[PDB]
C-alpha cells in the first residue's frame, strides 16, 4: 500500500530508465551489452566504457544516521578460471563519495556488501559460494541478491530469499553516500572478467522476509521456460541434460530406432584448476533439441505449457524422441527414432514449469498420444540394472515438489562462456 521502491531500474521503450517516480537519470556507457532476447539482462565487462551511471534526485541520496534502506538485484556471475582472481576484491555497483556510503563489491566465490560512515567506520556482510561443489546453485547462473540495512541493528544479505549473512551496524553513525550509482568492474585484475545484472532496485526500508520473498517470486514469475543458467529456454538450440533426481548422470543411447533406449548413466566425470574449481562436468551425453509443434508464437522462446517435439543427437544427426505407450507397465521406455518413421507413435510432450521457488528453469516434459491423453512426465525407471528413460503417469500422481517428482524433473544446459568447460568432441 505504500511505494518503497526509490529507484527501479528496468528496460522500457527501447531504454534502461528508472520507473520509479524519481525519474532518476541514467548515462549508459558505449561498451554495455544488453541481451537480444531480454534486454532488462545487462553485461558489464572490464573495460572503461562497460559502465552505467545512475544520477540519484538529492532527496533520495542516502545521508542518514538512521533511515533504513534495501536493495535487489539479479546477478550471473562467470565461474572464477584463474589464480588471479584469488585475493582480488572488484567493486561492481558504488555509491561510495569521500569514504562514505555503500558499495556491492565481488571477490572469488563471494559477493559482499560494505557500509561505511563519515568517521571510517565500516562493516561488510558476505555471501560465499564454493568452486569445489559438485554441482552449483550459484556459479555463472542467475541468482536473486537482496541486502537490507536497520540502521539500529543488522545488515542482512539474502541470497534467493533465504537469509545468508547478517552482521551489526548499530556502531555506524552519519553515512553519507553518492548522488551517482556507479555500475562498473572497479579493482579486477582478471581482464576477461564480466558480470550480468537485471532488475537492479532501491528500497527506502529494511524488507522483512515475506517481502523478499514476494519480490523473489514476482521477479522470477513468468510463463516463459528458462534454461540451466536461467536464461529464456528456446526452441531449435542443442541442450545438455541434467536429471534432478541423479544429477551426477547423463543421457545416453543404446542404440536408435524402436528396439534401442534411452538412460541415465553417470558419473559425469569432473572439470578443475587446482585450487581454483573442481566440478562435475555438464557437457555430456547426447543433446536435446525442442522443436516446435503447437505454439503460434513466431519466436523462438518455450513458454509453459507449449505442445513440442524433442529432438535427440546422435552422431550429428536429429532423432525423435518417441515410445509406443501400448508397451506393457505404466512405465513407457523412449526410444530416439527416426523422424519419417515415427507414425502414430507418441511424440507430443507439455512443456511445464514445475512452479518451485525461483526461475522457471525446473522442467516437467509430459508426453501425450496422438488423442492428447497424458502417457506420463519423462523421467527413468530401472530395468532392473540399467536407468531407462520413460514416460510414466506413476509420476503424475506424486505428492508435488517432492521426492517422488524429481525423477521427472530436468534442466537443460547449453554451452555457455561463463562456464568454460571444453565439449570432449
Ligand atoms: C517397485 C517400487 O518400489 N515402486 C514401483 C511401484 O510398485 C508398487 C509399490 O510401490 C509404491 C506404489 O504403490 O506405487 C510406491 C509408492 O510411492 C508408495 N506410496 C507411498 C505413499 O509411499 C506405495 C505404498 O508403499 C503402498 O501402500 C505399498 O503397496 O508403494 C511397491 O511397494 C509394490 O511392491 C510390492 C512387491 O511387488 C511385492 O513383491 C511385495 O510382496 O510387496 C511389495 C509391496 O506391496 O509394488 C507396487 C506395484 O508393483 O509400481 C509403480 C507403478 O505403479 C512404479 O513402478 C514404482 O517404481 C517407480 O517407478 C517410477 C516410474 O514410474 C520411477 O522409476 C521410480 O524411481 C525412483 C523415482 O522416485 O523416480 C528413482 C530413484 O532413483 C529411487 N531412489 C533411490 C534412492 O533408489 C526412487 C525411490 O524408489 C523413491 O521414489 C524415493 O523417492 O524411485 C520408481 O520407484
Ligand atoms: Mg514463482
Given at each position: 500500500?505504500?511505494?518503497?521502491?526509490?529507484?527501479?531500474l528496468?528496460?522500457?521503450?527501447?531504454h534502461?530508465?528508472?520507473?520509479?517516480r524519481?525519474?532518476?537519470?541514467?548515462?549508459?556507457?558505449?561498451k554495455?551489452?544488453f541481451?537480444?532476447?531480454?534486454?532488462?539482462?545487462?553485461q558489464?565487462?572490464?573495460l572503461?566504457?562497460?559502465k552505467?551511471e545512475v544520477?540519484?534526485?538529492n532527496?533520495?541520496?542516502?545521508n542518514?544516521?538512521?533511515?533504513?534502506?534495501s536493495?535487489?538485484?539479479?546477478?550471473?556471475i562467470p565461474?572464477?578460471?584463474?589464480?588471479?582472481?584469488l585475493?582480488n576484491?572488484?567493486?561492481i555497483?558504488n555509491?561510495m563519495?569521500?569514504?562514505?556510503?555503500?558499495?556491492?563489491?565481488?571477490?572469488y566465490?563471494?559477493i559482499?556488501?560494505?557500509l561505511?560512515?563519515?568517521?571510517?567506520?565500516?562493516?561488510?556482510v558476505?555471501?560465499?559460494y564454493?568452486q569445489?561443489?559438485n554441482?552449483s546453485?550459484?556459479?555463472n547462473?542467475?541468482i536473486?541478491?537482496?541486502?537490507?540495512?536497520?540502521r539500529?541493528?543488522?545488515?542482512?544479505?539474502?541470497?534467493?530469499?533465504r537469509?545468508?549473512?547478517?552482521?551489526?551496524?548499530?556502531?555506524?553513525?552519519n553515512?553519507?553516500?553518492?548522488?551517482n550509482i556507479?555500475?562498473?568492474?572497479?579493482?579486477?585484475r582478471?581482464?576477461?572478467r564480466?558480470?550480468?545484472?537485471?532488475?537492479?532496485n532501491?528500497?527506502?526500508?529494511?524488507?522483512?522476509?515475506?517481502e523478499?520473498?514476494?519480490?523473489?517470486?514476482?521477479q522470477?514469475?513468468?510463463?516463459i521456460?528458462?534454461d540451466f543458467?536461467?536464461?529464456?529456454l528456446?526452441?531449435?538450440?542443442?541442450?545438455?541434460?541434467?536429471?534432478l533426481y541423479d544429477?551426477?548422470?547423463?543421457?545416453?543411447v543404446?542404440?536408435?530406432?524402436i528396439?534401442?533406449?534411452?538412460?541415465l548413466?553417470?558419473?559425469r566425470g569432473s572439470?578443475?584448476?587446482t585450487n581454483?574449481?573442481?566440478?562435475s562436468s555438464?557437457?555430456?551425453?547426447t543433446?536435446?533439441?525442442?522443436?516446435?509443434?503447437?505454439?503460434?508464437?513466431?519466436?523462438?522462446?518455450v513458454?509453459?505449457?507449449?505442445?513440442v517435439?524433442?529432438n535427440?543427437?546422435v552422431?550429428?544427426?536429429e532423432?525423435?524422441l518417441?515410445?509406443?505407450?501400448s508397451?506393457?507397465?505404466?512405465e513407457?521406455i523412449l526410444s530416439?527414432?527416426?523422424?519419417?518413421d515415427?507414425?502414430?507413435?507418441?511424440?507430443?510432450?507439455?512443456?511445464k514449469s514445475?512452479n518451485?521457488?525461483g526461475?522457471?528453469?525446473?522442467?516437467?516434459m509430459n508426453?501425450?498420444?496422438?488423442?492428447?491423453?497424458?502417457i506420463?512426465?519423462?523421467?527413468?525407471?530401472?530395468?532392473?540394472?540399467?536407468?531407462?528413460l520413460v514416460?510414466?503417469?506413476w509420476?503424475?500422481?506424486?505428492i508435488?515438489?517432492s521426492?517422488r517428482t524429481?525423477?521427472?524433473?530436468?534442466?537443460?544446459?547449453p554451452?555457455?562462456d561463463?562456464?568454460?568447460?571444453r565439449?570432449?568432441?
Amino acid at each position: 500500500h505504500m511505494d518503497t521502491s526509490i529507484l527501479n531500474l528496468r528496460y522500457e521503450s527501447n531504454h534502461l530508465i528508472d520507473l520509479s517516480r524519481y525519474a532518476s537519470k541514467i548515462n549508459i556507457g558505449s561498451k554495455v551489452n544488453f541481451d537480444p532476447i531480454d534486454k532488462n539482462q545487462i553485461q558489464l565487462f572490464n573495460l572503461e566504457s562497460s559502465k552505467i551511471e545512475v544520477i540519484l534526485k538529492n532527496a533520495i541520496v542516502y545521508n542518514s544516521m538512521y533511515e533504513n534502506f534495501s536493495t535487489s538485484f539479479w546477478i550471473r556471475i562467470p565461474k572464477y578460471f584463474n589464480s588471479i582472481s584469488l585475493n582480488n576484491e572488484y567493486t561492481i555497483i558504488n555509491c561510495m563519495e569521500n569514504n562514505s556510503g555503500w558499495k556491492v563489491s565481488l571477490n572469488y566465490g563471494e559477493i559482499i556488501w560494505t557500509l561505511q560512515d563519515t568517521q571510517e567506520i565500516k562493516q561488510r556482510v558476505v555471501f560465499k559460494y564454493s568452486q569445489m561443489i559438485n554441482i552449483s546453485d550459484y556459479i555463472n547462473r542467475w541468482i536473486f541478491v537482496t541486502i537490507t540495512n536497520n540502521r539500529l541493528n543488522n545488515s542482512k544479505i539474502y541470497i534467493n530469499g533465504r537469509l545468508i549473512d547478517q552482521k551489526p551496524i548499530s556502531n555506524l553513525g552519519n553515512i553519507h553516500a553518492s548522488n551517482n550509482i556507479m555500475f562498473k568492474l572497479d579493482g579486477c585484475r582478471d581482464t576477461h572478467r564480466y558480470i550480468w545484472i537485471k532488475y537492479f532496485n532501491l528500497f527506502d526500508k529494511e524488507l522483512n522476509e515475506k517481502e523478499i520473498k514476494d519480490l523473489y517470486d514476482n521477479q522470477s514469475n513468468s510463463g516463459i521456460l528458462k534454461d540451466f543458467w536461467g536464461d529464456y529456454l528456446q526452441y531449435d538450440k542443442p541442450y545438455y541434460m541434467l536429471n534432478l533426481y541423479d544429477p551426477n548422470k547423463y543421457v545416453d543411447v543404446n542404440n536408435v530406432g524402436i528396439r534401442g533406449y534411452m538412460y541415465l548413466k553417470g558419473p559425469r566425470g569432473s572439470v578443475m584448476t587446482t585450487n581454483i574449481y573442481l566440478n562435475s562436468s555438464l557437457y555430456r551425453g547426447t543433446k536435446f533439441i525442442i522443436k516446435k509443434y503447437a505454439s503460434g508464437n513466431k519466436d523462438n522462446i518455450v513458454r509453459n505449457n507449449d505442445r513440442v517435439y524433442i529432438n535427440v543427437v546422435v552422431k550429428n544427426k536429429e532423432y525423435r524422441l518417441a515410445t509406443n505407450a501400448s508397451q506393457a507397465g505404466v512405465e513407457k521406455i523412449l526410444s530416439a527414432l527416426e523422424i519419417p518413421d515415427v507414425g502414430n507413435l507418441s511424440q507430443v510432450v507439455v512443456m511445464k514449469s514445475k512452479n518451485d521457488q525461483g526461475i522457471t528453469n525446473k522442467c516437467k516434459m509430459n508426453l501425450q498420444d496422438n488423442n492428447g491423453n497424458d502417457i506420463g512426465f519423462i523421467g527413468f525407471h530401472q530395468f532392473n540394472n540399467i536407468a531407462k528413460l520413460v514416460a510414466s503417469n506413476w509420476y503424475n500422481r506424486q505428492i508435488e515438489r517432492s521426492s517422488r517428482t524429481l525423477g521427472c524433473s530436468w534442466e537443460f544446459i547449453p554451452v555457455d562462456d561463463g562456464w568454460g568447460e571444453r565439449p570432449l568432441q
